[PDB]
Amino acid sequence: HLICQSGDVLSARYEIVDTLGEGAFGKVVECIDHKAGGRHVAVKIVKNVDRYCEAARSEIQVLEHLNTTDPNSTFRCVQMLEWFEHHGHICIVFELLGLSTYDFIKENGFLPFRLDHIRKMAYQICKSVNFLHSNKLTHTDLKPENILFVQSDYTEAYNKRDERTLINPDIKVVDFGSATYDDEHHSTLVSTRHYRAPEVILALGWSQPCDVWSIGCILIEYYLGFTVFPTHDSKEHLAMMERILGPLPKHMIQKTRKRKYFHHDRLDWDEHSSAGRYVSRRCKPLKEFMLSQDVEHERLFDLIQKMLEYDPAKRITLREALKHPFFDLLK
Ligand SMILES: CC(C)(C)c1ccc(C(=O)Nc2cn3cc(-c4cn[nH]c4)ccc3n2)cn1
Numbered sequence: 661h662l663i664c665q666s667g668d669v670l671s672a673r674y675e676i677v678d679t680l681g682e683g684a685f686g687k688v689v690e691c692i693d694h695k696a697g698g699r700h701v702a703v704k705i706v707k708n709v710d711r712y713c714e715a716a717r718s719e720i721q722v723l724e725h726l727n728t729t730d731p732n733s734t735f736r737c738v739q740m741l742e743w744f745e746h747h748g749h750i751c752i753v754f755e756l757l758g759l760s761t762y763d764f765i766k767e768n769g770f771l772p773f774r775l776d777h778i779r780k781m782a783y784q785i786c787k788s789v790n791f792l793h794s795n796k797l798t799h800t801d802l803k804p805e806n807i808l809f810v811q812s813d814y815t816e817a818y819n820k821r822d823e824r825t826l827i828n829p830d831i832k833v834v835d836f837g838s839a840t841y842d843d844e845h846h847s848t849l850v851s852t853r854h855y856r857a858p859e860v861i862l863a864l865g866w867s868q869p870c871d872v873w874s875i876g877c878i879l880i881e882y883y884l885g886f887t888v889f890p891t892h893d894s895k896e897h898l899a900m901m902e903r904i905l906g907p908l909p910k911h912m913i914q915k916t917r918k919r920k921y922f923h924h925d926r927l928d929w930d931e932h933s934s935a936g937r938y939v940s941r942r943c944k945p946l947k948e949f950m951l952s953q954d955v956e957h958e959r960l961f962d963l964i965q966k967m968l969e970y971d972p973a974k975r976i977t978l979r980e981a982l983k984h985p986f987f988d989l990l991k
Pocket residue numbers: 680681688702704738754755756757758759760808812834835836
């Protein structure tokens with residue numbers, strides 16, 4: 661807040677007019693670009709933390725590569741316009757987007773998206789991340805907060821109360837600070853808890869399939885308006901998985917160094933604990949979360965179940981996901 665107040669012309673070009681987001685990462689601000697004719701842009705002001713300078717370095721590198729391969733943004737990665745240093749911070753300039761998909765559900769009284777909208781968003785997410793995968797990249801940090809609408813405009817109509825309906829459901833993918841190349845160093849802990857794959861938690865090594873898991877979790881949240889993994893603990897997360905998807909594969913449990921979670925190669929979960937009772941009443945088999953048994957609902961959950969396959973070697977690829985009957989209605 662000391663160096664990012666309104667009116668500030670960062671690096672003698674970018675007039676700050678609003679702050680859009682704040683956190684440990686730093687801040688995202690809306691700016692007028694005077695040398696681009698007042699066109700509004702988003703500027704990520706990176707915190708002076710070592711971890712976030714490294715992520716910033718890597719996001720610049722990844723997007724310079726991606727925006728160069730896909731300059732028209734056919735595969736819906738956010739465009740990076742430029743980067744610089746100002747007041748000792750790294751600043752990354754992006755095309756301005758709208759509300760995140762998370763923010764939208766939130767601001768809509770936690771109402772889920774309509775299925776026709778989920779199909780379009782799911783297709784665009786899969787296309788985007790499949791493009792990354794074809795370029796030897798894993799995003800690792802896919803979540804509703806990192807899926808942003810191009811335009812946040814909505815119409816309002818009484819339904820309970822007023823419903824908000826997107827004028828344009830199109831999305832782009834953001835935050836490439838954790839994106840990792842196949843041949844480069846893999847961090848052990850990746851993703852925000854609610855969205856990390858079992859192979860990540862169990863430290864079994866990860867690659868592109870861990871993105872597929874995250875998307876599976878995102879689609880559930882679009883369909884329900886809430887997460888099915890409401891936890892802040894690894895072992896509890898695993899227990900939630902077991903209740904929703906069934907027990908972990910034995911071969912995965914035998915291979916993990918995470919012995920602390922297990923006892924005799926079974927999850928060491930105490931069902932007489934407070935956590936135990938909480939998991940039992942909040943979680944249930946995946947198919948029980950369905951709101952309808954109509955064909956297209958069955959198709960979404962068939963796809964979701966494939967995406968949430970425990971074994972990453974067996975998990976559906978995004979290339980295969982794009983061929984799923986759920987997307988047929990897009991033709
Ligand atoms: C409701 C209204 C006032 C109209 C509103 C709300 C939110 C936003 C917004 O949040 N916009 C926004 C955030 N962005 C983040 C990135 C990025 C993060 N990491 N990497 C890249 C890139 C572009 C980008 N645009 C814009 N308007």
